[PDB]
Symmetry: D2
Subunit: 143 residues, 4 copies
Amino acid sequence: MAIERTLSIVKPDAVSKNHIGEIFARFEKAGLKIVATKMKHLSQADAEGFYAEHKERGFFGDLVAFMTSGPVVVSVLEGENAVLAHREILGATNPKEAAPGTIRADFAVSIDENAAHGSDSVASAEREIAYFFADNEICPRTR
Amino acid sequence: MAIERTLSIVKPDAVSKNHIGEIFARFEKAGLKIVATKMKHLSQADAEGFYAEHKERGFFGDLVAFMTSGPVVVSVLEGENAVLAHREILGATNPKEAAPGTIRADFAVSIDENAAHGSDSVASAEREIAYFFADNEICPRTR
Amino acid sequence: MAIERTLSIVKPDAVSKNHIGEIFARFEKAGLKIVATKMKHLSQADAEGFYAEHKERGFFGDLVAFMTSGPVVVSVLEGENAVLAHREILGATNPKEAAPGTIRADFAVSIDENAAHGSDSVASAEREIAYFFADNEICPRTR
Amino acid sequence: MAIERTLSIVKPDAVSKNHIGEIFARFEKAGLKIVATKMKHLSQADAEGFYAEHKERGFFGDLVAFMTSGPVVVSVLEGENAVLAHREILGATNPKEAAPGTIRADFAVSIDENAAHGSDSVASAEREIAYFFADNEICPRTR
Ligand SMILES: [Mg+2]
Ligand SMILES: [Mg+2]
Ligand SMILES: [Mg+2]
Ligand SMILES: [Mg+2]
Ligand SMILES: [Mg+2]
């Protein structure tokens, strides 16, 4: 319905196995538009900040450790119902529970190394996009 | 012989028609690694600076117009023989002579809108990479 | 007496007459901490996005033309009462009615070329800061 | 006479004591122009890359730690004889040895925490600027 934006991250597992293009392609094929993107290697601090709402959770240490083990691609995806449509083609967090032809089905090995991230809601998307991108970096389409 | 780095730009035609992933997946499949990437909307000054070598050429104005008409994706590709490897994946500058399975063959409408740019030599690749990317921004593979 | 963040811009006038340091020293003396900064040459699109609220005003053209005539310095100042504190240091918009020792009084040539910009409130500070800076780019103090 | 470019870093000590403006002022007072600047918090990798040349040396870890202890301001300074001229203003590497009126004599505690960095030579300034800045990111004066 309303055109929304969501944060994608191609996680270090998918980057190291050179699946960036294949994953971007799935998004584009579903009608999401890439309106920002950049490759970064997160520092400890950078990861902890992104995930600061899970700072006191037990899983934080290993999450942070994985997400800093190699470079990631961060991207803003734009489209009708983007938050959810993105989640649709990402599929379930567990690859074993993920539908066929989702990203988790096709590219994830495990729960921890599940290939990609999408924001879980419109409020999270707004915060997550602002964590990685100045609005000045987002590139609306003009052709 | 050696591992080289080269600059890729996805031009505004291919961005606008949501081919970023497909193009990227062609580089990755051929064994090139994406070690940096960002989307930008080039200003006139950004584009003239990049293309300064062609400043006295007939096509300069049209090139700068086209390259500033909407957002691009600039990337650093790394691999064995990457400069020329990337060039053969791209195919002929003119899409009418480009071999099948090349990016210009598959995604370019015309010589003017030819989907993507690749650095033409090692010396040129180093300047064009430096133009868009601080050395600190390129993300070597770890893991 | 709450810690806030606000946007500062050193305008192309003050940049071109090399008053960046002097200006920065005023803020630091008054207690504000510089937690993000960058020099940028704004494109017309960059400037039109920042000043979007004024897009229908007759002065928009002049404003955008001046804010893109040369490089600026964009910064995030943090401190107690940061928004209005920053404003008292800047002084009145018009230099002719700004109190001696304010930024406008000492560095502004005219109303149009009034040396610097400061956010006018908390809502606008948040919007302005986010326009130029990813949260990941802001550097909280660590010693 | 030859216009040169050199790298300035305001180190984590001078930042934390809010001396950035005071230091920039000295550069501009001396006729150097700030043509790029940013605040960053360097990670271990960022610093290891900058100081790669000294990596087998025995001060390397001590240097990497100090330079990651807090945020820094990295700048490109432009002017007549900028490398040597910048070096004169900084003063002797050891602030106990530094002439009065030099930023090391006036802001530096000790040889560990000497307040600012400067490129040593013209060949090294160019590598060091290229590490932190893309060519396109540096802002020549246009007004
Ligand atoms: Mg686990
Ligand atoms: Mg912009
Ligand atoms: Mg006027
Ligand atoms: Mg950060
Ligand atoms: Mg430029």
